[PDB]
Design a binder for these strands. Sequence first.
RNA 1: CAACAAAUGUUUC
RNA 2: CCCCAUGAACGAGGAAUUCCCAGUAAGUGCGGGUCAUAAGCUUGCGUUGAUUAAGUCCCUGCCCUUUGUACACACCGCCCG
RNA 3: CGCAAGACGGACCAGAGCGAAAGCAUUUGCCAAGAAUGUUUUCAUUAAUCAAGAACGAAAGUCGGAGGUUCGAAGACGAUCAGAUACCGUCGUAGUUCCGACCAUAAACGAUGCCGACUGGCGAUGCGGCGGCGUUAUUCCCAUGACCCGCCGGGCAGCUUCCGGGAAACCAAAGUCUUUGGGUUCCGGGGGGAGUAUGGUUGCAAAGCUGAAACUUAAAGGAAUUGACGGAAGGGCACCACC
Lengths: 215, 136, 107, 64, 126
Amino acid sequence: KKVVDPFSKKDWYDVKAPAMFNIRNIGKTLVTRTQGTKIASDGLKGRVFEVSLADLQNDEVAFRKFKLITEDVQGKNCLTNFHGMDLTRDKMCSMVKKWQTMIEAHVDVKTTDGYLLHLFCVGFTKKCNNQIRKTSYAQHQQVRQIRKKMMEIMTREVQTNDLKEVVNKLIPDSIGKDIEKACQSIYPLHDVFVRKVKMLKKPKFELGKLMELHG
Amino acid sequence: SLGPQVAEGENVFGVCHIFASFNDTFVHVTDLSGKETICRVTGGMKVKADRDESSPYAAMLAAQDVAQRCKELGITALHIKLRATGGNRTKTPGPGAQSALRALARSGMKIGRIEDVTPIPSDSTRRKGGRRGRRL
Amino acid sequence: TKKRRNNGRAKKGRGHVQPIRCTNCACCVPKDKAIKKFVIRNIVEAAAVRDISEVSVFDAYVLPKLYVKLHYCVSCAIHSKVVRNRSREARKDRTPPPRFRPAGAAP
Amino acid sequence: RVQPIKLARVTKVLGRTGSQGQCTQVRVEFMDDTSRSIIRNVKGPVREGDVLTLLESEREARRL
Amino acid sequence: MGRVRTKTVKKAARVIIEKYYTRLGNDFHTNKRVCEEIAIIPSKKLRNKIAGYVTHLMKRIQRGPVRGISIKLQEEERERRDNYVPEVSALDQEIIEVDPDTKEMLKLLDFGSLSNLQVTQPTVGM
RNA sequence: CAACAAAUGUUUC
RNA sequence: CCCCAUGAACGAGGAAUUCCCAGUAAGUGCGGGUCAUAAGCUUGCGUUGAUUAAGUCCCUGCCCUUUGUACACACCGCCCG
RNA sequence: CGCAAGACGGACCAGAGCGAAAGCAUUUGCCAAGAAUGUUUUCAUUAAUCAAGAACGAAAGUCGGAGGUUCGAAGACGAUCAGAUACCGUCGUAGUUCCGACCAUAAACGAUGCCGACUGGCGAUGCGGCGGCGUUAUUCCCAUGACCCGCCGGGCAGCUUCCGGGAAACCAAAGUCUUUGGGUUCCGGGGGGAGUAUGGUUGCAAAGCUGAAACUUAAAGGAAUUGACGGAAGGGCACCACC
């Protein structure tokens, strides 16, 4: 029986990104008018938006995505925090080519602020120009030592430094380059990225750091 | 109706989300969180025949009925996640998925990024109905 | 009388390999046997990009791809002319080919 | 969702389809704006320079 | 199409042209008279069909040598053309530039020569 | 771009 | 054959299906063959004269490669309880 | 958006690897094991191949639990058909998965015994060793490392070849077979009756091994060749075909 079309009731908030990113005004989102029987901030607070790092930086960051999760609300403002980085589908699919070895290593590590992260890396062998084998695999010995190197760096590079510096780090892709330096002594490699980061455990609350990062 | 804000420049943003399978085509904008909907409508509802559930022309009609209320409630713009049946299912796009995208862009909403989100599985759960294949 | 010296498709040094499921019959065929065709295509397609480029914000952007590696069992890949009977002689040619790389102005 | 009517002029006659062989391929200069150009299938006898009245104005076929 | 000249005709055309080039012409009307003089052809329709195809040939020959026809005059023309030779092209200009090893090719061949070195890098198959 | 029904039955020869 | 009279069904044809591209389809009369007599026939001829593809291999039919075949009285062929 | 269960290890992944074969792709650790190579180490004939005996042995099935996510031998359903107990849709079973026992069979095909020698060209690739006043990558030079080129073993193979083989298809082994003789082991003697009867044996069971006859019958069969013909592929052509 005709009733309550719902937008004509809904309220708007402006999604705000952390400081390390560049521009910070992500877009807008709608919730229901708060009623005592309700907390529009409730239906608002653990929401996560996934935005492209390119929109976030402005660029070459076509591939790469960041998951931004709403951590608190202040009048039409909602302050989000790093929740993850993935790659998309197209980019990842495009690296994976036959005749080359695909190498993956991932490590789970606690940051300086508590956060627990599982953080993945990836690489592919490279034929080097005057090669004339068509393929370019690596040996099992190689990959085992390469993986150890990737893993050592990723734990080394996340142990020291908080969620923010990992972020500050993943933007100019300094890990990538570091891997490249530690591995060329062992075997070629084309591509190379920390390709995903997964938030496993969150520390408790603290608006302090959140604001430090926003505001 | 309504609008997040006057904005003679940037556009209020939502998520487009199209599932194209064969035998139908879902179009779907939601709030960039996802938790809250906004105007759905499928390629089914706008024709009758079951056989024609999934045809691009129906798909157009659906993306048109959708874009309407999209620009009628507040979304000025939308980022799209196209999908297939996925799972162990086919893994290829259904026919009126393209048609829906051409229909909304043409409609005159705004577009932003794209990824595919069909669920591809580090394979298993045996695919349906048996070893000798659908024979037909 | 034995037809292909390769029998089905290349094994030689095995006796076994896991089987895949046809992407059409949902059949079942060893992975050594089975026609495989990669499939990379733009999210948008032919006509769209122009409305897709105009309607979008962003200054260019610049289109994702969907990537899908297909598998067919013999009967499907024949049926649908993925592959076509070749004379007692032509069968021996593994190679591959066409003349330009059909990407817009082909058949 | 929609309506309009589109005038389009034949640029180049492609060849013939339909298994019966009764539909003629056509390429159309978009009349109201030349900076458009698309492939449409025909019922009748068509020759260069004469005009189609397109309903759908996207679509753009192929075989059948 | 429907008018595809048959060998009995096409042959006669190659034939006459081979032994008649400087006599024959550009124009249907005259060769037709010529076929009466230089050949014995049984019906008038055939002789016409012959004159006609051989003219289509003469029209073509007189615009570019045609795939299987030779006449004394065309041989003479090709002969003269097939003389050309300039200031000449190698030179190659003072000093050959070698790829070395090719330098070591002369060095260990007991042979003086002009020189230049630029030969390094390997070197992939495919 | 992919895919698509169909029975039986009298002679020497 | 005529003259009168008696004045039927048939008021557009289901399943099916023939034939056809330009003086062609179709209307329309004439003459020849049969012939003593006998035209609803066949067999041409002029007259009046369109609609409509202008192609293709779908169905059908037949021949072109390649291919499969336990067929070869050749698929109208040679099979299980 | 989170979470639980059970399943499975995609893309990368190949005429590529290993393993006696059956078979075997997530990380990491432990445990022993296996080939190749290198090797102026050790023994001095230790050795080749095999009745009997024995180890392993995909799948289904069977015994008892765990477990059943997924899909699903049976059944019940909806359609289709002249008939439909089917294919096709749906619901859905034992089962799939895992543990401890059975069972001993798969076009378990390379349909090709195993071992040794000899007879023919080229380029790949896994791997080991060896060589280069070759490339690129670094520091102050390096030790590095990956490559290019060559050489040699032993892998799985490929390619081209009037050696030669074979009925041919094919085959560098199916060669070195009437000029018939390197070692050893196994099975077959027209086709059906038949892996059947019967006794023995193994099995909880389902079944497995060994394995006849009476009778029946003049071809069974192989290979190549060619048509005919196809609801196989590129095919065409004609209003006796369609449009």
